[PDB]
Amino acid sequence: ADSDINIKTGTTDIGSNTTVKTGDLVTYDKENGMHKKVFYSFIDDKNHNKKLLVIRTKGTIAGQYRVYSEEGANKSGLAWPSAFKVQLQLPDNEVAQISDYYPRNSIDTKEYMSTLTYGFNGNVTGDDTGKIGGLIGANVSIGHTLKYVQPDFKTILESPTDKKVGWKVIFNNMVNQNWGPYDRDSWNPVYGNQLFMKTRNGSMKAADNFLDPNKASSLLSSGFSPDFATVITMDRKASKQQTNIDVIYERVRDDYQLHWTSTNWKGTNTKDKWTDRSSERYKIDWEKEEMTN
Amino acid sequence: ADSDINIKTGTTDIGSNTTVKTGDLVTYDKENGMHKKVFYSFIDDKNHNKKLLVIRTKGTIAGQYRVYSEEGANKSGLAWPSAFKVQLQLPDNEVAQISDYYPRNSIDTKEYMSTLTYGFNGNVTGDDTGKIGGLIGANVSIGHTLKYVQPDFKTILESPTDKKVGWKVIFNNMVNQNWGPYDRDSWNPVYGNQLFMKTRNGSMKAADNFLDPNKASSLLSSGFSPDFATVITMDRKASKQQTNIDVIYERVRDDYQLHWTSTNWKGTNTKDKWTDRSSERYKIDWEKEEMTN
Amino acid sequence: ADSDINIKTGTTDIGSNTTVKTGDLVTYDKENGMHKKVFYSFIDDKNHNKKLLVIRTKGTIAGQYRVYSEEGANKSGLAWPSAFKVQLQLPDNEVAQISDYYPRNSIDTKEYMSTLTYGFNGNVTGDDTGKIGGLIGANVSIGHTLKYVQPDFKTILESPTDKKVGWKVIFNNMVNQNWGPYDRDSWNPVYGNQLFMKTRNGSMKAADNFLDPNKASSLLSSGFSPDFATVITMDRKASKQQTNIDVIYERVRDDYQLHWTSTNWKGTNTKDKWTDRSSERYKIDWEKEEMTN
Amino acid sequence: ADSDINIKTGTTDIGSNTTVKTGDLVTYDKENGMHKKVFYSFIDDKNHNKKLLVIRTKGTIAGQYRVYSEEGANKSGLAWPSAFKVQLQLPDNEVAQISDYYPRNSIDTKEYMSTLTYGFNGNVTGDDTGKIGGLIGANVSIGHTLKYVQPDFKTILESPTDKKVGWKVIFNNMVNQNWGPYDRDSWNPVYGNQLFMKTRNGSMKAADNFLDPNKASSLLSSGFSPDFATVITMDRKASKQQTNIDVIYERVRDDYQLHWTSTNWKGTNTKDKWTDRSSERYKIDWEKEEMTN
Amino acid sequence: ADSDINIKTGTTDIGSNTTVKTGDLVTYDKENGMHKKVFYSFIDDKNHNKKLLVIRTKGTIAGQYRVYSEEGANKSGLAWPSAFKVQLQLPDNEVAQISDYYPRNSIDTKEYMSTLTYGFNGNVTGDDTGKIGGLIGANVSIGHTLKYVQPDFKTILESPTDKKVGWKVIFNNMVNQNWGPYDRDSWNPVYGNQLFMKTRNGSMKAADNFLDPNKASSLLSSGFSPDFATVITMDRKASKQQTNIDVIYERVRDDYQLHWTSTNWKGTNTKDKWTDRSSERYKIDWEKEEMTN
Ligand SMILES: CCCCCCCC/C=C\CCCCCCCC(=O)O[C@@H](COC(=O)CCCCCCCCCCCCCCC)COP(=O)([O-])OCC[N+](C)(C)C
Ligand SMILES: CCCCCCCC/C=C\CCCCCCCC(=O)O[C@@H](COC(=O)CCCCCCCCCCCCCCC)COP(=O)([O-])OCC[N+](C)(C)C
Ligand SMILES: CCCCCCCC/C=C\CCCCCCCC(=O)O[C@@H](COC(=O)CCCCCCCCCCCCCCC)COP(=O)([O-])OCC[N+](C)(C)C
Ligand SMILES: CCCCCCCC/C=C\CCCCCCCC(=O)O[C@@H](COC(=O)CCCCCCCCCCCCCCC)COP(=O)([O-])OCC[N+](C)(C)C
Ligand SMILES: CCCCCCCC/C=C\CCCCCCCC(=O)O[C@@H](COC(=O)CCCCCCCCCCCCCCC)COP(=O)([O-])OCC[N+](C)(C)C
Questions:
Q1: What fold is seen in the domain A1-293?
Q2: Which Gene3D superfamilies match (chains A, B, C, D, E)?
């Protein structure tokens, strides 16, 4: 906090008394259904040291959650997005550099609780025949309790090198039919991986026996809208004022297959089955303060 | 709070009615993968007593979480970052001084709860043969409950001397596979240190039997992005207006080795195995209000 | 709240339409490792009655947590900071006076909860031979639950007299290895004071058997950064416009010794073993609105 | 809330477009250790109807927590502050009046919870000899739970008459050694009042066997800093423009004595033992807008 | 929320670009100890339709909690305030009207929770003689939990007619000596109403055996400070510009009597015993924008 140093709040910020020429570019890849978008802003403050440029790759990525193949009632498949990714890269011989990026890895906290209990007991037993009995007892108990919050999808920031920076979204785990949370590597010897399982021993058709997309998480079927911000700085005395950028919106799917062995349904997961990449190259003109492509 | 003294809020702050010449420097160490960055700001308020300069060493440090060595299925190793560090130092004969630093040690709180319970009981027992029995009893219980929040990574501020100040990030403990939180010194006589253990008695290959990086904390594999702020003040009447600074982004790793003894997997940890340091020297020109290197 | 009286917020504050000449002084005591700092601000509002001056003794104090003496494996010592202190004093014959101070003693609250429970029970017992039995019973229970938050270090404000004001930080208690919170006066007949105890009956060397500094609280090893604010007012018609101030950053340590009696480790604490004081005298010139020393 | 009536926020406030001549007075009573302070502010808005004056009696009161008398090991005494008080009074024949006061009595809330439980049970018992037995039972339970927050010190506002207004701080109850909260009237037939008791049956000296001041609440030993605000209004056409005020900072202590009867320590409390009052008379000049004394 | 309609926040408010002539009136009724106060404000916005006037009857009402009569040790009485009231009324033939009032009745919410539990059990019993026994059982449980917050004093708004509007404060219930909350109609066949009962079977004098005022709620003994706001609007073309207002601060007490029957103390409550009213008539001059009386 800039105010915790006695520095007046906002003194160290940049962007005062300057005109920023923003813009927008929208392009849709019908083949992959990735409504990618970039929102940039040229900031050139005379009090600064280098020209600035912030790229907000808002865009949007489809879910692609459907049964790709069905083979009778014996077995059927299913493809779902395991992880979403978006990254920005620059030419190796280029002069511009990546400075900052808002969504970054953050430390996680977990609660903890220890319980210690003492106890005592004593009773008198008697009956019609006049027998009298006694009982004295005691007990101790110790208990450790740990709780934490684990989101279904956990955003991560891949190691940002100078020339390229890339984010990532993965599938931590999901809760199905109010049962214990499952994940890709969850296994059960009898049923197997029950992540996307409708009924344990249903008699319906193989393809029909799948978890409803509405019940599952919104990202899987309805897509995930990203919001990542990066800032690019380039020296104001550079001989060449043209820069090239590349934007990637790759998405990784998985294969989920149900198998009827003799009585119950069995499920198996094949992580990293298909990968779809949609890369477009943009051009930057620092002199004209415009990104067009 | 400046407002709790009846002083109008922000009156004691510095930076009003002045022009601040900010800047930026970005350099990447491919050898160590440390995308270090410094964001400075020259504040020279005539109402102040000394020139000011705030260095925000945002930067970023890679994770370097991989199996460095594998030796068949008998055993395999693993290297992970135990602690991240970043510090700023000045020449001993220099005249500038360190004034403040935002992230600082903070007191920690823990809950507490004491429980006391009384009880009474009485029942009548009878059967077909007409036997009637009685029972009177009582019990007491006392319970102490203590809970607190312990983050996986706990930031610390090393003893800040005048010439140098240094922060630190360490590995408090981690939760594995929803089991009890482990740490570097955790030991189990049968299995041993089970921090990064995939399966207790899995039959897979030695190298494969490791916790997935996605399951583990984000910092270990995807790196840690620091945000530390320091302010440097130098007298306005100093004969020499040039100052030299040094920035360090050292990172410490550890060695984790799994051993198959006869049936189960055994794990051992060797703290402070390797250390990587990447120091760069910057130059400060108070007269020109610019940091270049 | 000034707004709860219908007075417009901030009307009663002081510091409007005036120029404040702030400053800074930094000095480091290598002998004691106390990076003391003072940040002042001269406020002289014509609408006010007396000149004002606020001293923010931010500074910083080292931890000094190390094993001072080791004597073989039989026993070893340990010195840790029991309490931190910082206070401001004025000459007895001086004319300036202490007005206010932000961090002040605050009331503490504790939860409370009373539970009352009734119960009834009735069962029928029968067997193969046709015997039928009955049982009717009842029970009552009363329970008192009390929980509160107790920080490890509890800041206190010593009785502020006109000429001097002094704060204080003490060691309330600590939680070790997720066990019951201990404190200086905690005693156990078998083991003794187990505050800084690594293992109850470890076979390692005497000096090695100590709690890791990382596990313990951050203040003990990495130091404590204070932030206390005071305001000094002096009459504007005083004949002499020069004032002298004294700043103290005294820190108190303790001695902790482990003793191996026959099988287990025994620990004893000797409170108030050593005291370190580092006092520097500053000079105030109200006429020139500057503090220099 | 002025905004809940559709009136623009702050429209009804007073203090706009006016100059307020604030001030300060500091005086210390070494005899009683009461660093009393008054911070006033003259508000005279032409749009208003009467002149205004707000007195903020911040000040500070010492704790005075020490063993006043010790008589061997048989018994010893102890004096602690039972209640703090501060009030403002005006001459009976005066014309000024008390209008408002910020800290005022507030309603208190308490939680509540009712629990109802049904239960059923049935088991089959069998042994090697083939005997088969059954058991069917049921139970009901009702539970009332009530919890609330009770601070150690509870501020109160004495009945404010026109000429004088007075606040009050009392000792609600305290928690000792993590045991049940005690208070002045708490009594135990065996031990007695165990409020400030160190050990139930300790063998140390009578004077030494007292609760450490650090463990007890901060107010008792380190003093209590008050913050009460009052506003005084006087007609602008009054013939006499001079007004006299009186400020009181009375503090009430108590006597606590431990008695060793035969084996254990016994404690008794004598409420309202001593009272200390420190009254100073200030003078107000509405015409000159200044309070001096 | 005016901003939820897309209307810019504060557009519909009234009071912009206008001068408000506020005021104040203070009068104390020594007979009843009711430090009544009214704070008004004349708002006349040309963009408005009618003249406005807001009356904030802050004032303050004493508690009057004392033992009115004592008759030996056999029995004694006690008078406490059951309910506080404040209302504003206008002449029937008057033309002004009541528009709004801030403190208004609000809906109350209560939590709810349903619990369902299944259970199974099975054990094997064996002894030295080789007898082996078994036991299999199961159980079910259902539980409804409801909790809510009930303040001791619950403010209410009486049916506001055009000519008069009146608020009300009543005594919902109180918690005594950490026991179940009692109220006026609470009855116990053995002891009776135990609201203000010190000891169930104490041997002290009848008058002394009362709950300490400090333990009870602050309002009962130390008084209640009200804060109610009303706005009065009168047409700008009215022939007569003078209006009369009446302010009432009536307070209702109760009689509480303890009776020693043979062994224990018995308590009875007589609701609505005495009523005190203190009405003063104010005069309003819209033309001069002043309220004087
Ligand atoms: C290693 C040594 C061996 C163990 C020694 C003793 C244990 C076994 C004894 C033997 C079993 C006998 C049981 C009797 C009572 C048990 C509680 C007790 O002993 O003290 C308790 C005090 O906690 C309290 O607050 C007191 C409990 C009742 C309070 C009643 C107050 C007034 C009574 C009138 C009521 C009406 C009015 C109510 C108020 C208005 C707890 O203390 P402790 O138990 O000594 O705790 C240390 C020991 N331990 C950790 C191992 C458990
Ligand atoms: C050291 C001295 C020895 C112990 C003495 C006594 C204990 C053993 C006795 C012997 C065992 C006999 C058990 C009988 C009852 C037990 C509760 C009791 O005694 O009083 C309880 C009062 O708490 C209440 O609120 C009353 C409980 C029922 C309320 C019913 C209200 C109206 C009844 C109609 C219902 C329908 C309508 C319901 C309402 C609309 C608790 O008080 P205590 O228990 O005296 O607590 C101090 C003692 N102790 C700390 C050691 C526990
Ligand atoms: C000092 C006097 C002696 C004690 C007198 C009685 C106790 C011992 C009796 C004897 C033991 C016999 C036990 C029978 C029931 C116990 C509960 C009971 O009595 O009333 C309870 C009412 O609470 C309820 O809400 C009712 C409980 C069941 C509700 C069923 C609703 C419809 C039934 C169809 C279900 C299907 C559909 C469900 C709905 C859709 C509680 O009231 P109480 O218990 O009278 O409380 C005062 C007494 N006490 C404080 C001392 C405990
Ligand atoms: C005054 C009248 C006398 C009392 C009448 C009955 C009580 C004693 C009877 C006699 C004792 C016999 C016990 C049998 C069951 C007890 C529960 C029951 O009766 O109904 C419960 C329904 O609550 C539920 O939700 C149903 C419980 C099981 C659900 C199973 C679903 C599918 C089964 C397949 C499982 C696998 C798959 C699971 C799902 C995927 C509760 O209703 P109630 O108990 O009627 O409540 C009113 C009565 N009472 C208030 C007095 C309690
Ligand atoms: C109306 C019909 C009659 C009732 C039919 C059955 C009840 C009585 C049966 C008869 C009693 C026999 C008891 C056996 C088990 C009871 C639980 C059970 O049946 O299934 C449970 C599944 O919940 C789970 O998640 C499974 C429980 C254990 C998981 C173990 C995982 C791997 C095993 C290795 C462990 C090591 C590694 C662990 C993992 C790494 C609950 O399902 P349900 O009970 O069928 O619920 C519906 C029925 N009911 C509502 C009426 C209750």
A1: Leukocidin-like (2.70.240)
A2: Leukocidin/porin MspA
